[PDB]
Design a binder for this molecule. Structure first.
Ligand code: NI
Ligand code: NI
Length: 312
């Protein structure tokens, strides 16, 4: 685990958007960052909930397909998912690094050291096989250098561990050396007002606020206080929603946008939902009716907010 201070890597709103945005920043690719920072989305998969997979937040994953569509539609940027093999992945990395200097790779977070596993043991943290996105910067004789943009860490990983991480079965499915090529046959210029108008229109038309209500209604039905792991998953999933709210506050300041006056209050409500979910998971604090009521209140507040944003 890393000695130095944290890296000033692009946060985005999830691991995928973090990696795309950090890649775009380092390689001077315009549009990508603004398209990420203007995203406004919510999903809920009740099937994923009862499999205790990542069932809510800004976007399904690990690959953010809606973000890929936005990059194509707004900037004519195509993010191609390549698959490779145990015998080919490193040579293909060498070719990518010589041409581009960076390779975006799907990795099993289990093998990464952005989290100090030794020190976290004390706090009853488990080391899970979760998919994550890293940026490969260097291939050496027996090791590689990777950046973790989402967690603002970097490390030298053994060639053995790097290959293992990129060939691993995770809780969400199999990695086979997946990498992400950012391509344009002719980039297109988008604007902040267009990006927000399209996002907030889609949010209302697809009734994404309804998916918050669904999440809340499903929380209300968790009557078993002895099985709370869903609450930790929910806590982690909603980080993406907090990041979108903060990203929109930061867009408002940068571009002097007119916003409804309760954006910070909505962010605060999401932070409270996350606090109550974590403390419920951790030591059984609060109750599922209390948490459900708050999720259903924010659902209505988010519907109203999206309507008010589209008027201005
Ligand atoms: Ni650290
Ligand atoms: Ni800590």
């Amino acid at each position: 685990h890393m000695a130095s201070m944290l890296l000033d890597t692009f946060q985005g709103y999830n691991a995928y958007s973090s990696a795309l945005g950090e890649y775009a920043k380092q390689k001077n690719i315009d549009q990508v960052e603004n398209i990420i920072l203007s995203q406004w989305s919510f999903f809920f998969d009740e099937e994923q909930f009862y499999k205790n997979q990542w069932y809510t937040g800004a976007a399904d994953g690990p690959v953010d397909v809606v973000l890929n569509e936005d990059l194509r539609n707004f900037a004519n940027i195509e993010v191609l998912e390549h698959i490779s093999s145990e015998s080919q992945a490193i040579d293909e990395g060498r070719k990518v690094l010589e041409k581009h200097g960076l390779q975006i790779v799907l990795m099993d977070f289990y093998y990464m050291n952005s989290f100090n596993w030794k020190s976290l043991s004390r706090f009853n943290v488990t080391r899970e096989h979760d998919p994550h996105f890293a940026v490969l910067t260097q291939i050496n004789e027996n090791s590689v250098h990777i950046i973790d943009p989402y967690y603002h860490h970097e490390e030298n990983m053994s060639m053995e561990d790097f290959i293992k991480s990129r060939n691993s079965m995770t809780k969400q499915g199999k990695i086979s050396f997946n990498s992400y090529e950012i391509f344009s046959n002719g980039t297109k210029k988008s604007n902040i007002k267009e990006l927000l108008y399209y996002r907030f229109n889609r949010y209302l038309q697809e009734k994404m606020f309804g998916k918050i209500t669904q999440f809340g209604q499903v929380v209300k039905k968790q009557l078993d206080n002895k099985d709370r792991k869903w609450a930790f998953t929910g806590y982690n999933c909603l980080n993406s929603v907090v990041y979108q709210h903060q990203n929109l506050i930061n867009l408002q300041k940068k571009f002097s946008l007119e916003m409804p006056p309760n954006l910070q209050e909505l962010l605060d409500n999401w932070a409270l939902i996350r606090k109550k979910l974590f403390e419920y998971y951790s030591r059984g604090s609060y109750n599922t009716e209390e948490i459900s009521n708050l999720i259903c209140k924010v659902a209505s507040s988010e519907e109203q907010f999206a309507q008010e944003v589209l008027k201005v």
